Symmetry: D2
Subunit: 387 residues, 4 copies
């Protein structure tokens, strides 16, 4: 049951199942995986595709001949399996040169290098067929207040993204960018810390249509925010270009648990929203099998990501299709929420005594919302406990 | 020392010093204050002005004659003291009718009433000379996932703000709106939970120039965010129309401590930013004297808000003016952060071997940022411990 | 299905279903309930009993004749329904006199009054058959560092609890005390903020056997802690005298959602633990139907508390009984965790070369824990998705 | 000014200034330091001593001859500088063998090895003169609910600490143990997550007098707790055997900022408490110079730890010595908090009409606490802004 197929568009970063287990306090617990291995194993589980940072696919500092051979082997694995590469990204965080940032490093020479490193990988992403190019500015930020003038940093961040937009336009590429917010870690505070901040920033770019967000479940939850709500705002803005799925237990370091772990009910409401809205992008997992696991546990954890999505999809669909739930949604006036407040226009509203002088506030206030019965129907559907 | 004067533009909500002390678990500990009392006492402390919700000034349900008398007494107090009213707002949260929201209530009749209540108070705000009209949508949100379709709610929120913009335009008013984000409380999750989400929303309004943000120190800190960083993004966007100053100890219920309490170093960096950027708006305190206090403690707490701002202003100015700090800022390359990455343009960057093939990443990575010495100079300045 | 019976020992505070909906920002949305109404309605839902603060049952300041009549009516309702009263507590938080605390108020006269108020209610609790007397010191704490010397406050808190222990001993009562931790709210920080702090404090009382903890799901989660882990430590100490069940979404104000809401997987692991350990006390709900609800929603929310416990009980039992899970637990060495490390004793351990010189650390480190497969079996059982 | 001397008992872990800068997302930014270098540089800054994990001083897997040479060089550096070694600890977290724990690993063979590794290092600690042996069980815990039976794990943790107590007793050593709590990171949840949980656990050990706590500023703040309050409870229990000083910005990953950074006012109240209580142990810094820094920044950050302690010590002493503050403390009834509630005894309290029938609750409730004026005096003293 719940068997994923490539139809489901489940994708995984090479760095997810390939995470060797080094953490702030601990050495690696697993050997490095050859990307070819990961492609073949993920395909066997029913994944649709993989994603990569430049330096996951091509060791940093590789010669041109080494680069070609790494890409050739990877492409053979993709061809052997039918796996796709819908998204790629740049590693602008691991190498010590990026310790104060890539695009917003105080040192101008580093900012220029970061751009050149990204541009090289955009070309590769396009060659591999990627539709989306993600940017996670994990080093953009500060541990202290004097270290980073945020207005200046936002100017530099806009300059960088504008140059990248000029680049893809000039090359006729169809790829689009997706900015991945995170509130903190590894920097004390990261610039563009939430979906909202990233959406707002995009509106100030020179070609805003080329940029959207890549929200990650656990990152919004590191600020204690409601991930489904943030996804709804991104969808409302037309900016949900990609998504990172995982689990998180609240306000902690970024745990990258398998999807469905962490906040299970938020996972349910997320899947309900994505499916109801017809989100058509990859269902991408940015997760880490815990370092307690051997490779069998790696593949079990990856399989669990997809399984949990599919269980939740089934339960959310059953919730929405249940005539009792539809009745409860009407009892709670969800239908009214979807209707304009004043399609009659401002003057009609101002002239409408039913909206003021003759509005019976106490009668209105007496009406219960019936939200608890609705939510218990949702719980019963999630748990398969209807009756 | 540190004596406030009206020049400093310190303002207070009537509901701040007037908070009677009722909390989720406790009855009022102080009697209600007459707004006239608050105006006169705040003036004696050196405040510049006050702000109000409609229902702080005019008891809910007042007749037209009662409304006129309350306003007349208030205006006499303002005239007697020289106090100004730079901002007003609507109470769309206390009355039970607003239990599921004002502008985004599921019930359409409530949404219409909320708009009419706001419009009535915009007229009053203009009559009292207010430049800014704040909206804190404290009831907009949900405790459960099925209760609120966030895309539909954002449609309703946009409709409401668009109607208000049409209203002020049609009346020729110069007032502008400032949306106040909060992540949660009293709703389980509040819509537009951070400065970023509010900034992003504004960009989708029909007349975006009429709307900005009213960020509150403690509200961003309830999501664990960096308040100075968020203010910097608002300033970068040209949207810091007003600000609410207070203190908060991290991820808790909204404490509304006096300004300077809570995160003291964030208060320092905030004042540094506001003063450096030349923010010209009110320095408004949205705080609550703790319910442990009698009225002498109320006025002590209000005086402390202003005193702490002025101490921090002095220390931040001394930091920025210190030649040793200026040297440290250059050592940390803050000057370079402010210079364009690639004013030479994209093609020149692509052709620049110093940005890629000839960039010595290891030499760059070896350079220390000297951020710790800079931050210790900042600490020494804050504490008045230079030497 | 999942129909509660009095056998299940589900209990509710009068103040739960009776919460009128006043919050930090909002007036009551529901009328007050007569305790008799609540007893009868809860009995109809299959509850076993109720609990009370003194001032929930007897209006503060009642005359002796009024007190007798309130108790008489309540006892008739209990007799009419078969409902029990297993626990009672004192309200040492609502009245303004308790604004700085009850037992740890700085004012000695208030501390003495708090003790007398508690003692009066202990007598009533015993008359009603209560086995446990809870103490939630919600006002014990501070908003500022100078206001409360915590060592002195702990001396006063110990003195108070020691006097209460002397009292019940002197009267020959069998009741025992259960201290309810909370980290913050309504005080900026509350004394004894977690299960651990309360357990540690109890060990320093003169008659430690008379005192245990009353942990509340949401309170530990307000510190981001693992509630099942804390319950395990309380059970390990022999101190889980009572429990408060509800839901919470992380680090926020105390939401008191119905049980099962909030962190659903933590609710699953909690029920698994309570049932596996044979916890024999009340399954008490300290929750608040949201203020959006009318009375039908109140009773739906209360019914949902019990329903969710029973669903989770079924799923946890099925998990533990599944031979595949039992195999996975052995694969993950849960059996070994339960066996002594060194029943052979210290000298044998020191002499055992297999524990040091001949321990193959790399072979040990290569063994995977298989925790992800175990956790996915747990997820499948919770969701009823085995297959 | 504020120049540290060995008199001040400032100590640093080798792993603090020696942290190479590897984080969850980034490679090392600094070369490894020879412990001899760190001892000499710290001495030059005015430190009193250093501390070590076994594997900071002796590379893991060293031969007996290598071990002797590393220790000999270290002891020469200590002798050359006058630096002391007051505390040592075991690394039971870095090596992959400890991925599920040391003392509470599910695998019994690992638990036995962890004990043997600790015992070997206790012998070395004693030889170097350490008074305290710290245990930070960073790997004790879980990412999933089924992986770790917490009651069984607590049994294993007690067994381990009891064996260590038997060991030191049998050898006649005067060293004592200090358990360091942390709520999470690197495990999803760590056992003994707070000072309270550790204090409670200690009470159940066979020789409780041999064990205390080593609380760390940032670790309690990762649960949003009040660090000074927790230190007060540890002092009240007689269990503050050692302390780790650093800074943290709230509920995040463990930042290990220099002391004084993070929550500055909590740092002030901590120093006030330690000095007022006469804490006589090391003022130990467990911090990490940010990876942005070169070695000059490492030493600046270490110097800043000590400087900030000394500034705060001065300001707290001035606060306590100020006759205006002493008056404010009396106005706020801090003197009364320190006096017994009922030294007259239970019967006298029960017979005292002034404690009940004749207690004027409304007159008591009208008295203000004057906590805000007290706290503003504290702020003025911290900032050196009295006047
Ligand atoms: Mg629709
Ligand atoms: Mg500039
Ligand atoms: Mg067992
Ligand atoms: Mg004393
Ligand atoms: Mn992540
Ligand atoms: Mn991601
Ligand atoms: Mn607030
Ligand atoms: Mn505000
Ligand atoms: Mn609660
Ligand atoms: Mn409770
Ligand atoms: Mn730490
Ligand atoms: Mn430490
Ligand atoms: Na700039
Ligand atoms: Na979209
Ligand atoms: Na709509
Ligand atoms: Na602005
Ligand atoms: Na005392
Ligand atoms: Na127990
Ligand atoms: Na056991
Ligand atoms: Na002590």
């Amino acid at each position: 049951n719940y068997a994923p197929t490539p139809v489901d568009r489940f994708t995984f970063g090479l760095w997810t199942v390939g995470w060797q287990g080094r953490d702030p306090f601990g050495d690696a617990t697993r050997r490095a995986l050859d990307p070819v291995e990961s492609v073949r194993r993920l395909a066997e589980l029913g994944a649709h595709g993989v994603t990569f940072h430049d330096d996951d696919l091509i060791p940093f500092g590789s010669s041109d001949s080494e680069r070609e051979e790494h890409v050739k082997r990877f492409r053979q694995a993709l061809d052997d399996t039918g796996m796709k590469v819908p998204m790629a990204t740049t590693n602008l965080f691991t190498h010590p040169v990026f310790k104060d940032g890539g695009f917003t490093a105080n040192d101008r020479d580093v900012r220029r290098y970061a751009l050149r490193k990204t541009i090289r990988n955009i070309d590769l992403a396009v060659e591999l067929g990627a539709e989306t190019y993600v940017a996670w500015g994990g080093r953009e930020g500060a541990e202290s207040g004097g270290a980073k003038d945020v207005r200046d940093a936002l100017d530099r961040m806009k300059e960088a993204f504008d140059l990248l937009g000029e680049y893809v336009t000039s090359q006729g590429y169809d790829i689009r960018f997706a900015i991945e917010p995170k509130p903190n870690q590894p920097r004390g505070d990261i610039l563009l810390p939430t979906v909202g901040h990233a959406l707002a920033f995009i509106e100030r770019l020179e070609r805003p249509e080329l940029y959207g967000v890549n929200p990650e479940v656990g990152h919004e939850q590191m600020a204690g925010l409601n991930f489904p709500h943030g996804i709804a705002q991104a969808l409302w803005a037309g900016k949900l270009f990609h998504i990172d799925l995982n689990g998180q237990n609240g306000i902690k370091y970024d745990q990258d648990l398998r999807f469905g772990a962490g906040d299970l009910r938020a996972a349910f409401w997320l899947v309900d929203l994505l499916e109801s809205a017809g989100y058509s992008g990859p269902r991408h997992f940015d997760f880490k099998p815990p370092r307690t696991e051997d490779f069998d546990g790696v593949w079990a954890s990856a399989a669990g990501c997809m399984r949990n999505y599919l269980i939740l999809k089934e339960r959310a669909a059953a919730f929405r299709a249940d005539p009792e739930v539809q009745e409860a949604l009407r009892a709670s006036r969800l239908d009214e929420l979807a209707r304009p407040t004043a399609a009659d226009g401002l003057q009609a509203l101002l002239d409408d005594r039913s909206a003021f002088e003759e509005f019976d506030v106490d009668a209105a206030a007496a009406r219960g919302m019936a939200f608890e019965r609705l939510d218990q129907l949702a719980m019963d559907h999630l748990l398969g406990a209807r009756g």
